[PDB]
Swiss-Prot record, chain A:
Chain spans, region Integrin-binding motif: 4-6
Impact when changing residue 9 to S: In strain: Omicron/BA.2, Omicron/BA.2.12.1, Omicron/BA.2.75, Omicron/BA.4, Omicron/BA.5, Omicron/BQ.1.1, Omicron/XBB.1.5, Omicron/EG.5.1
Consequence when changing residue 6 to N: In strain: Omicron/BA.2, Omicron/BA.2.12.1, Omicron/BA.2.75, Omicron/BA.4, Omicron/BA.5, Omicron/BQ.1.1, Omicron/XBB.1.5, Omicron/EG.5.1; complete loss of interaction with host integrins
Protein source organism: Severe acute respiratory syndrome coronavirus 2 (2019-nCoV)
Highest taxon of source: Viruses
Consequence the record notes for mutating residue 18 to T: In strain: Gamma/P.1
Protein name (Swiss-Prot/TrEMBL): Spike protein S1
Purpose of the protein: Attaches the virion to the cell membrane by interacting with host receptor, initiating the infection. The major receptor is host ACE2. When S2/S2' has been cleaved, binding to the receptor triggers direct fusion at the cell membrane. When S2/S2' has not been cleaved, binding to the receptor results in internalization of the virus by endocytosis using host TFRC and GRM2 and leading to fusion of the virion membrane with the host endosomal membrane. Alternatively, may use NRP1/NRP2 and integrin as entry receptors.
Subunit field text: Binds to host ACE2. RBD also interacts with the N-linked glycan on 'Asn-90' of ACE2. Cleavage of S generates a polybasic C-terminal sequence on S1 that binds to host Neuropilin-1 (NRP1) and Neuropilin-2 (NRP2) receptors. Interacts with host integrin alpha-5/beta-1 (ITGA5:ITGB1) and with ACE2 in complex with integrin alpha-5/beta-1 (ITGA5:ITGB1). May interact via cytoplasmic c-terminus with M protein. May interact (via N-terminus) with host bilirubin and biliverdin, thereby preventing antibody binding to the SARS-CoV-2 spike NTD via an allosteric mechanism.
From Swiss-Prot, chain B:
Phylogenetic placement of the source organism: Viruses, Riboviria, Orthornavirae, Pisuviricota, Pisoniviricetes
Source species: Severe acute respiratory syndrome coronavirus 2 (2019-nCoV)
Consequence when changing residue 46 to I: In strain: Gamma/P.1
Protein name: Spike protein S2'
Physiological role: Subunit of the fusion protein that is processed upon entry into the host cell. Mediates fusion of the virion and cellular membranes by functioning as a class I viral fusion protein. Contains a viral fusion peptide that is unmasked after S2 cleavage. This cleavage can occur at the cell membrane by host TMPRSS2 or during endocytosis by host CSTL. In either case, this triggers an extensive and irreversible conformational change that leads to fusion of the viral envelope with the cellular cytoplasmic membrane, releasing viral genomic RNA into the host cell cytoplasm.
Coverage span on the entire protein: 982 to 1029 of 1273
Top-level taxon: Viruses
Amino acid sequence: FVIRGDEVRQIAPGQTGKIADYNYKLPDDFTGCVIAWNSNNLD
Amino acid sequence: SRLDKVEAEVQIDRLITGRLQSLQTYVTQQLIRAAEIRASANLAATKM
């Protein structure tokens, strides 16, 4: 997916926030990896 | 209530550990005093 820079910190277990509240949330026992990078020069 | 869930879990671990080892201390003290009383009781039975 694509998110704004404001929500970048929001991707972590137990975090609140607009995306966390109503769009996308992580479990506490999430066993995985998170990768994100800027794409302003393309979008 | 007043903290993040993970930090609260870290906090609760402390209470868990403290109360658990305190219970262990009470149990050990009970064991020792039980040894005392049972030895004394058998002594009393022999006396009687």
